[PDB]
Amino acid sequence: SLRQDILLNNNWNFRFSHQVQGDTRRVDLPHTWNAQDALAGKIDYKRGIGNYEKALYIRPEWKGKRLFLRFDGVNSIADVFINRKHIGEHRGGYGAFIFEITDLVKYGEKNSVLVRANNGEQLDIMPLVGDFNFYGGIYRDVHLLITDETCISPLDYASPGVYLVQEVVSPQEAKVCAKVNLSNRAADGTAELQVLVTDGTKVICKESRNVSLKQGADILEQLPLLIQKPRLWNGCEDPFMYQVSISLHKDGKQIDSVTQPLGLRYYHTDPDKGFFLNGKHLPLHGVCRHQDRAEVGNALRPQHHEEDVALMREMGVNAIRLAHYPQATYMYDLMDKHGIVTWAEIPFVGPGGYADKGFVDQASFRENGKQQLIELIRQHYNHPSICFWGLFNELKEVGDNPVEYVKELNALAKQEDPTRPTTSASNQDGNLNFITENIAWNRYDGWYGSTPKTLATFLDRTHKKHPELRIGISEYGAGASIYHQQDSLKQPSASGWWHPENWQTYYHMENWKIIAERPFVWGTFVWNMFDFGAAHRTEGDRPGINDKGLVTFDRKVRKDAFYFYKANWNKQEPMIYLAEKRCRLRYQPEQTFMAFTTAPEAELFVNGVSCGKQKADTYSTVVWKNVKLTSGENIIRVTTPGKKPLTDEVTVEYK
Amino acid sequence: SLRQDILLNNNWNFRFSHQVQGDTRRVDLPHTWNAQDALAGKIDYKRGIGNYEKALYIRPEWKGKRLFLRFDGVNSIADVFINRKHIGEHRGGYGAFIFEITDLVKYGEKNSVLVRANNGEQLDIMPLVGDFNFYGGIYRDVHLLITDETCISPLDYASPGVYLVQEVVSPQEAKVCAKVNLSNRAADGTAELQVLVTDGTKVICKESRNVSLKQGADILEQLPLLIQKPRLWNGCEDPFMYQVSISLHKDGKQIDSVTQPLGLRYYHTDPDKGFFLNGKHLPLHGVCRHQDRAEVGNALRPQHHEEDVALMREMGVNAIRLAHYPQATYMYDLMDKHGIVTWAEIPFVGPGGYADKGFVDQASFRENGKQQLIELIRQHYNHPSICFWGLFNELKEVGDNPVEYVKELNALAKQEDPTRPTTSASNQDGNLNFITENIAWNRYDGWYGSTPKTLATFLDRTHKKHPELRIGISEYGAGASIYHQQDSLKQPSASGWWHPENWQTYYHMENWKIIAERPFVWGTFVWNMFDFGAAHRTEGDRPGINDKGLVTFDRKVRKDAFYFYKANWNKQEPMIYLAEKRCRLRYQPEQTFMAFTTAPEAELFVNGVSCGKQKADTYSTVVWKNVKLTSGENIIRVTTPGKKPLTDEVTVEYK
Ligand SMILES: O=C(O)[C@H]1CNC[C@@H](O)[C@@H]1O
Ligand SMILES: O=C(O)[C@H]1CNC[C@@H](O)[C@@H]1O
């Protein structure tokens, strides 16, 4: 009677097609075959076909039901076979996809499921280029879905089949259109469709409709909902969601059901005053996050998403840009749950300072880009956290000019979802910046040359020249190795093998001050919350890594800048953090010590003797200058005021 | 006036000799060139020559002083050049070495220091084989040492030049012979040698001697010390050490000085009753630890040693086998500090289940083995934590038979240091087991076949047949991936790609029970405290890794077995830990839950409803059987008794 969702992750037989003999090894999903070679900095890591095969017992009692194989993600092309007969293809590495196998299997026996995954280079599947790894394989879950022959359809771009369209939302009332896809393979007849909105045990809406479904029908039903005096999803202040059950009934029996969240809110972006959520100004304190991790590549487990979100909330993050592609359903779920305003985007990624192009002007590429956009929007439609749809990152006009195609994507986004604005992330001047509703730039003033001050100049000049633009900062950052430490502050070469941590700290303190004074900037996103994989990189403390994270690739170590942001953004958790603790060897005659704290002041101790109190500045920073160390070991301690104080401590050597 | 010790770790120019053009890149020590390729499971990772060059300013005011380059470790051959002229060679990857450069430099200018490091295969430098990576390069610190022309010699196998020989130790008195190497390059004359033993500010011994030193003299002075009613170094109970200052004086001026610890104790090993420290029985709750780590290979920083020791102490470790080679001075220092009884060993490593040999019977190999043993003993002589010198690991008699050579090494160890017993780690029957004073075996009953019970049978039969042997277990362990989880307990294939965590947990619980009942076993050492690198491995959740750690390779995650040992070994820190939390998906009709706790009992809750209390067994384990889950999410909580209880919690899905 109930819909079943069966995980098919364990024990698949794997081999590369370049291994011609046919023998296989066991693997377990999520899986990528690029977790060792790409992460070792091998620039020509394996990009081609890997094959997964599993024997699936089709239970006799599933006869009469409908059966679907749903894939959460396979990078980048998947060809699926049942009993070695081809059933379909998916092109795109980040969107879910589904095939019905109801009439393709033999009931009561083992059937072969074969997936031939290809992450070889293509010129007709975005992303074509990018500063990250194109990890190959079935790197998200695989499900066997089992439903009634009359069901809420899972066949609409592999979405849940329900779109809760937020037409009008205010504190007085919300009008929602529940769009429901129905799929019928039963004999001609009827069913009753019910849409139930609840808050815990309390019933908020219950709307019903009798529907006549022809054999073979695949149709869209639209049920209007009205909620009086709604409780709004209000970011981290109150991430409230209703639950919606959508169900089908025949003769007073429920025969199918799906649940989706309903987090109601309204928003706008003001060119002069920034982002407003539910009628109130909201600074977007944002970071970016790639979907990979040390040692496992992009084969992330649920605890990895959970941990990433825990670290961001610890830091006081209230906004995120999930670059550079559609990410996991579970990850958008955590954004919903924790109230994090989210920018979600398609992988329409340009070259940046590197070679080749993000756009190749041929129908196959362009049609496939539209498919990946429709996938993004339909598959992730109901997540309240998503407040912006991103259409590109660092495209450029030279050669194949993407401006007209990006206009087509913008119009398609607005058609698919008029309830959210489009955005984009640019490193260019010119017409590419004037298509999406909001615009943002990737700025590295003070890292890739210049000084942080030119970010202030760029922001002010652009805002004055183009007062209609809603200006954001879609990336800003600096590299750091936790193993590169020096007593003095000196700007390093960005592309070199020396990325002292103190420069990243300096960079973020200076850039944050510029942002904090400019409320017309509707959101800013640190590049990046975590170090991440990019095989071609040859910089910092090891190849193959982009080290602009606030936290290391294995999520183990928070860099000093993490705590600068935590003090400023997470003000209600008491803390004190001494900066430059990893710089154990000191040689400067005049030592400077610096702490980040939520307290109004702090006290410094050197070798157990107080150096006195210093006040925190407006950026939660306390600084002591001309501190005198003695030759050899020195114990440095900082303490907040109060009867029960907080402390941080380190032993440094002075010579 | 003072001895100077200057770190030369930053900014060296590096290239491989296979890169013939001559251009270089910046590197910073500690460094290995095998941190990416070997750790990616590349079995033919780079083994050959890497070159490091640094310009060193020789200060005019160093003229008249003596200058030394001291290397803490270079794997495996180092050729050192000053202004591109060869000054010496070291063969051996784990012992320190030193060259005087006093008369080789130009004062008042930059001098070139060039180190040509080679980790290419050799048949004349142990280890010849082994289940670990032979990471190449200058992977420990480099120092410039500056002393008076008359000094406590740093030239005796690069040791501190002072051996505090523990002749007789008891609670009534300790007799120590302070052996001091003196090196003179001043004009013929005299100096006063002082040996000062202190406890904080309190003076315990002060012995002095006037010495006549010819020009060019390199001599040994021996000063007897007598300490009445000493405070003994007593393991974790009281890791007390005196400090010894050894100084040279001319005309009432101190001209040189070195400090060494003096941790006084006595011990013996009883064939029937196990290890006795300072006259009292002491169970050795041991683990093993390799000197590498995720992402950095063996280029460990001080915080890495510190963290490894923190994790071991957290687990209640009181003994360690620092396999399979001499490890860092700083690491033995931490063992001294924290009271951990230590087995230190030379890299005389045999093949185990793999090919080739640990012993090649040729003079060059054998003489070099003796050098590495003398290095080990002289360089690490004064560490109280070291209570055993290990001479080999898994050698075998077939082909080149090492028995007679190992007897030579045993006699050499006893000559170099009669104050500690020799030991060895065997996987063989026969004559190899009857050479060293203590013997131990590497046992994998229940992992590499058989069942844990045959360990009990082996231990009892050996002990009965050979009542004179002091029997230990130098390794025991099982593999586990934290990403391999299954609801049921089933023994996996050791060499396969599936290492469910629950089997490692089962293995350690069963083996520990066998050990705990057998006090004639003087020490046991878990293989291994941490997952570690072994490029040739193809098992568990990724290639290139030996996953028998209780803690993951990046030191981030403690496996369930870590907490079993912590509950049993660290009884005075209150804790409760629910096992199998990583096994999120449950399907067994009858669920079993298991907790490790220091409490006498604990209570289980399922979906907020108590299932009742259960008593902890003698191994700190609480178990609830036939627990009923409901379909879908279940919240599982366990709690200790008391007004302020401890808790552990997890959400599992049942289907
Ligand atoms: O250079 C960087 O670190 C960033 C530049 N903008 C685009 C990002 O993908 C890239 O990673
Ligand atoms: O097989 C194992 O895991 C161990 C067997 N004994 C020797 C170790 O070096 C090795 O790692």
From Swiss-Prot, chains A, B:
Motif N-K motif, residue range(s) on this chain: 546-548
Entry binding sites for D-glucuronate: 393, 442, 448, 527, 548
Reactions the enzyme catalyzes: a beta-D-glucuronoside + H2O = D-glucuronate + an alcohol
Lineage: superkingdom: Bacteria
GO biological-process terms attached to the record: carbohydrate metabolic process
Role according to the record: Displays beta-glucuronidase activity with the artificial substrate p-nitrophenyl-beta-D-glucuronide (PNPG). Is likely capable of scavenging glucuronate from a range of chemically distinct xenobiotic and endobiotic glucuronides present in the gastrointestinal (GI) tract, to be able to utilize these diverse sources of carbon. As part of the GI microbiome, this enzyme would be able to reactivate glucuronide drug conjugates, such reactivated compounds can significantly damage the GI tract.
EC number: 3.2.1.31
Listed Gene3D superfamilies: Galactose-binding domain-like (2.60.120.260), Glycosidases (3.20.20.80), Immunoglobulins (2.60.40.10)
Record comment regarding domains: The N-K motif seems to be a discriminant that could be employed as a fingerprint to identify beta-glucuronidases from the large GH2 family of proteins.
Active site: 394 (proton donor)
Similarity section: Belongs to the glycosyl hydrolase 2 family.
Keyword Hydrolase listed: yes
A GO term for molecular function: beta-galactosidase activity
Organism encoding this protein: Bacteroides fragilis (strain ATCC 25285 / DSM 2151 / CCUG 4856 / JCM 11019 / LMG 10263 / NCTC 9343 / Onslow / VPI 2553 / EN-2)
Alphabetized InterPro entries for the sequence: Beta-gal/glucu_dom_sf, DUF4982, Galactose-bd-like_sf, GH2_Domain-Containing, Glyco_hydro_2, Glyco_hydro_2_cat, Glyco_hydro_2_Ig-like, Glyco_hydro_2_N
Keyword set, alphabetical order: Glycosidase, Hydrolase
Record's protein name: Beta-glucuronidase
Signal peptide, first to last residue: none
